[PDB]
Design a protein around this ligand. Structure first.
Ligand SMILES: Cn1c(Cn2ccc(C(F)(F)F)c(Oc3cc(Cl)cc(C#N)c3)c2=O)n[nH]c1=O
Lengths: 411, 526
DNA sequence: ATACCCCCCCTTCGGTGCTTTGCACCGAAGGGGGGG
């Protein structure tokens, strides 16, 4: 039949022992009828008390999906097995994928369930279903086959994936291919009627050889938003003081940003609300400052060795930002995620969709998910984020309790 | 009898226990000989180096090192059931199994790891006591016995905690008796010696602290300990008992009782008049016992929240008006500086997560706060916060925003500047306003942030109703901008009171020790 | 009797990370209730 690749951990550290958080009654009701079916088809099997490893589980509803799905939080397993994918097999990141006109994302994880998994590793991927009012203990199940959402599963399956997609790569060398987790990114420089034609052609092609998969985003049409200083004719002491302070803050990002004449301009303890003249020397200083700000930060470079860190600041009125970088004060990218559509309905949902957009863009551009620094309290985030989640990947996040009151990316 | 065992092992590195046994003791020989007949504890040869400690009471066999050396076991249980989450059931029965542990076999390979030498050596064919995974092993086996019955018919609702088997149904009495007898036989088929059907309980029950009636429930009656002199330990016991009682009795305050504990088991301390008065009030509340009710899925949960003052809230989850399902209080204070809205959202988060844990769904809240207030707060706070769903309820005290720090400068208000310093290797405060108004003053046990807060307090002290301020530190901005009410620092409380007294205040920030604007003078004197 | 585990509740430490030297913060412990 189909063989399996043994999986080994890194000796010296333990496996996943994450306590499984509670779930709504409907989530349990759907997960029962999903995991019973998965057990009937030999995909999963039960286990007894002797298994000391557990991972969470929750039933999301996919985008425009009449049914439910399932996700298992495999963050700790990846945290313990990063070296498996970092050494065994690594797919090169296409530099041209960032510059393609459009790409399409398909959920190709179904074939991940048709490949048997190792015997020794099979123990580690055990997940617990909760119970209503904890009347009965968790029915702890075990993945018999390769699991959807596990980082090391694509490493195993990429050989057969390549074998499948080699005809498509041959007949269509223009298309660029990138697989991340259970998702596949296909990149083309075609029109809507032709991009859709080729994506449906690829779907039919996968159907012809026993692989079934049940939106469009433009990598090239993403533009960084450069910071700018406010400009007007009548300036006050308060406004010029704010401008000098912002020039200070921004001197950290830009080495060449200086403020000395404006600092020397303000010497007396004057009222904030009075109108103050602005000399032509300050005009030239402001022009040079804006010229520096318009240009992207000189010397910006990327290192795959480090991890990607993304901060988010909420500017109100249904507007958020996101800054992705590795080394402090030299941002690799900045953005502006704005929507007033869901403002009247939700607030955390905005943060969830922002996080999804950031991680999708980072996967398209640099290829690895960012580590998020969310502006939200830990428990209120952990209570509700799953209710507004639709992506089969799970990014890593940590809540910085420090108040970032600067917020000079947008006054 | 036909119960397949479960593999047992240990943490890698070294074998089982090796401490010398003790045959002679307070007789204790014929007790274990009887189980050799039916094989619960069998005889083994003198080739067992895995010696174990021996104990017998009137057999809590000691495994003080075996539990330290046994492989880690995952927690089978994840809490304790609550009566409010039980649906209305007509017929109910309890079938607590006999000792739950001498009818479940132990793994064949593992028997060699434990021994009982009473001259000779006996091996355990059965689960011992003081064992790491014994509740988990029995619970899994006990589910493996149950599930064919539940699959046969799901009408019968079965709860199970530790060794206990709570059966409920909406059928007639005789049909329920027939079904429970069938369950008894089904359990017996796998070799469980349950107590006789005459010994099963009939309502009202007594559970883990909760007495259950055909249509109501409550906790077992409790009394409040009384003594002229209180040590700390009895105060902690009283606090714990009050917290336990706070699940069904509305409006229980245990905070300003708990502040007495801040001064510290056997050590004895005096009391406070507040403590005695509120203990009497709590005794008056607990004098008359109240009743809860049972869940009804054909309806919806509607919780309400009230504020009792100084960071304490009470909630009362129910379904039918003035018929509580559950009650509770939230009082914990994490961090330093919070207003009432932050604590209110913490309270609603805790209530909804508890409701998910218990009844598996969230309640449609009722909050005592205006819609526009929460709208402004969530559109103005820099963090992201949410509230599930809530309707306005008019009940004082009414939580609201105390003071609004202006986001724009105002005319007709003096512009103050503030600064201070200290010694890095005992600080001072000193500043110059737009007209030279200086109030330099030293202070002890202070640093840059303390003297900045002191300068802010001074500027508020020597200003009018409307005033604008320019600061050289972001720490004060972070403190005051959150609109705080209560704080550890009394200076912060005074500043908050000053801002409440005033009408409109606007702030700004400048870089420190840079000589920019008014920073030259304020960083010159101090 | 003196050892053994689960949710809840508090108070009091330590360590983190600068917000870098106090401070705000959070997690782990030490008692309390319920007991098993
Ligand atoms: C008294 N009573 C009731 C209440 N009630 C309703 C359902 C069940 C169920 F079938 F779920 F077990 C009950 O069994 C339990 C559950 C628990 Cl946590 C503890 C105890 C004890 N001691 C008994 C039950 O007590 N309904 N009708 C009536 O007379």
């Amino acid at each position: 039949p189909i063989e399996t690749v043994p999986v080994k951990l890194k000796p010296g550290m333990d496996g996943p022992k994450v306590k499984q958080w509670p779930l709504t009654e409907e989530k349990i009701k759907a997960l029962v009828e999903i995991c019973t079916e998965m057990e009937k088809e030999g995909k999963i099997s039960k286990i007894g008390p002797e298994n000391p490893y557990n991972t969470p589980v929750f039933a999301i509803k996919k985008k425009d999906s009449t049914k439910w799905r399932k996700l298992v939080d495999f963050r700790e397993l990846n945290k313990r097995t990063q070296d498996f994918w970092e050494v065994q097999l690594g797919i090169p990141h296409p530099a041209g994928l960032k510059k393609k006109k459009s790409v399409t994302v398909l959920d190709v994880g179904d074939a991940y369930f048709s490949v048997p998994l190792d015997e020794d590793f099979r123990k580690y991927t055990a997940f617990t279903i909760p119970s209503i009012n904890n009347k009965t203990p968790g029915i702890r199940y075990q993945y018999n086959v390769l699991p959807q959402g596990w980082k090391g599963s694509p490493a195993i399956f990429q050989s057969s994936m390549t074998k499948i997609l080699e005809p498509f790569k041959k007949q269509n060398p223009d298309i660029v291919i990138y697989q991340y987790m259970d998702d596949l990114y296909v990149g083309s420089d075609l029109e809507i009627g032709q991009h859709r034609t080729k994506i449906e052609e690829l779907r039919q092609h996968l159907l012809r050889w026993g692989l079934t998969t049940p939106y469009e985003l433009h990598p090239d049409k993403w533009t960084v938003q450069p910071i700018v200083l406010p400009e007007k004719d009548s300036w006050t002491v308060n406004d010029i003081q704010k401008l000098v302070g912002k020039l200070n803050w921004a001197s950290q990002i830009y080495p060449g940003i200086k403020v000395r004449q404006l600092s020397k301009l303000l010497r007396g303890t004057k009222a904030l609300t009075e109108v103050i003249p602005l000399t032509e020397e300050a005009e030239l200083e402001l022009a040079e400052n804006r010229e520096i700000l318009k240009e992207p930060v000189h010397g910006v470079y990327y290192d795959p060795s480090k991890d990607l860190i993304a901060e988010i600041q909420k500017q109100g009125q249904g507007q958020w930002t996101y800054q992705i970088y590795q080394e402090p004060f030299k941002n690799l990218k900045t953005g502006k995620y704005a929507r007033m559509r869901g403002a009247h309905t939700n607030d955390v949902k905005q943060l969830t969709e922002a996080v999804q957009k950031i991680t999708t863009e980072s996967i398209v551009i640099w290829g690895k998910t960012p580590k998020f620094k969310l502006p939200i309290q830990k428990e209120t985030w952990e209570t509700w984020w799953t209710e507004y989640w639709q992506a089969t990947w799970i990014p890593e996040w940590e809540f910085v309790n420090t108040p970032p009151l600067v917020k000079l990316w947008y006054q | 009898s036909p119960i397949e065992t479960v593999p047992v092992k240990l943490k890698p590195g070294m074998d089982g226990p090796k401490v010398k046994q003790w045959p002679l003791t307070e007789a204790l020989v014929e007790i274990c000989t009887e189980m050799e007949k039916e094989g619960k504890i069998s005889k083994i040869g003198p080739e067992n180096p895995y010696n174990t400690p021996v104990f017998a009471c009137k057999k809590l066999v000691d495994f003080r090192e075996l539990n330290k050396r046994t492989q880690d076991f995952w927690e089978v249980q994840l809490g304790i059931p609550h009566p409010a989450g039980l649906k209305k059931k007509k017929s109910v029965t309890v079938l607590d199994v006999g000792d739950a542990y001498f009818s479940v076999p132990l793994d064949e390979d593992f028997r060699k790891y434990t021994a009982f030498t009473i001259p000779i050596r006996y091996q355990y064919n059965v689960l011992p006591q003081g064992w790491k995974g014994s509740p988990a092993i029995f619970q899994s086996s006990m589910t493996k016995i149950l599930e064919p019955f539940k699959k046969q018919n799901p009408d019968i609702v079965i709860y199970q905690y530790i060794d206990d088997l709570y059966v409920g149904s909406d059928l007639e009495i005789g049909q329920h008796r027939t079904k429970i007898e069938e369950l008894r036989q089904h359990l017996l088929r796998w070799g469980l010696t349950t107590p006789d059907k005459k010994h099963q309980k009939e309502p009202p029950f007594l559970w883990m602290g909760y007495e259950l009636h055909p249509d109501k429930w409550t906790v077992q009656p409790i009394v409040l300990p009384e003594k002229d002199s209180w040590t700390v330990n009895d105060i902690q016991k009283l606090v714990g008992k009050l917290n336990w009682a706070s699940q069904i009795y509305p409006g229980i305050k245990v905070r300003q009782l708990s502040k007495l504990l801040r001064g510290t088991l056997t050590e004895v301390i005096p009391l406070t008049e507040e403590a005695e008065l509120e203990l009497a009030e709590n005794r008056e509340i607990l004098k008359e016992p109240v009743h809860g009710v049972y869940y009804d899925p054909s309806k919806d949960l509607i919780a309400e929240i009230q504020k009792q003052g100084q960071g304490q809230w009470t909630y009362q989850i129910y379904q039918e008006p003035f018929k509580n399902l559950k009650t509770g209080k939230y009082a914990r204070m994490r961090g330093a500086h919070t207003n009432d809205v932050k604590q209110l959202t913490e309270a609603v988060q805790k209530i909804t997560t508890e409701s998910i844990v218990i009844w598996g769904k969230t309640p449609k809240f009722k909050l005592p706060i205006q819609k526009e207030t929460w709208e402004t707060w969530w559109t103005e706070y820099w963090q992201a916060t949410w509230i599930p769903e809530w309707e306005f309820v008019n009940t004082p005290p009414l939580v609201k925003l105390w003071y609004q720090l202006e986001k724009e400068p105002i005319v007709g208000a003096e512009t103050f500047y503030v600064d201070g310093a200290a010694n890095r290797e005992l600080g001072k405060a000193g500043y110059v306003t737009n007209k030279g108004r200086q109030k330099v003053v030293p202070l002890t046990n202070t640093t840059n942030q303390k003297t900045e807060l002191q300068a802010i307090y001074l500027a508020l002290q020597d200003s009018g109703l409307e005033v604008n301020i320019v600061t050289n530190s972001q720490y004060a901005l972070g403190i005051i901008q959150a609109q705080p009410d209560k704080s550890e620092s009394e200076l912060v409380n005074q500043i908050i009171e000053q801002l409440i007294k005033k009408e409109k205040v606007y702030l700004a920030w400048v870089p420190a020790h840079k000589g920019i604007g008014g920073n030259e003078q304020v960083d010159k004197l101090v």
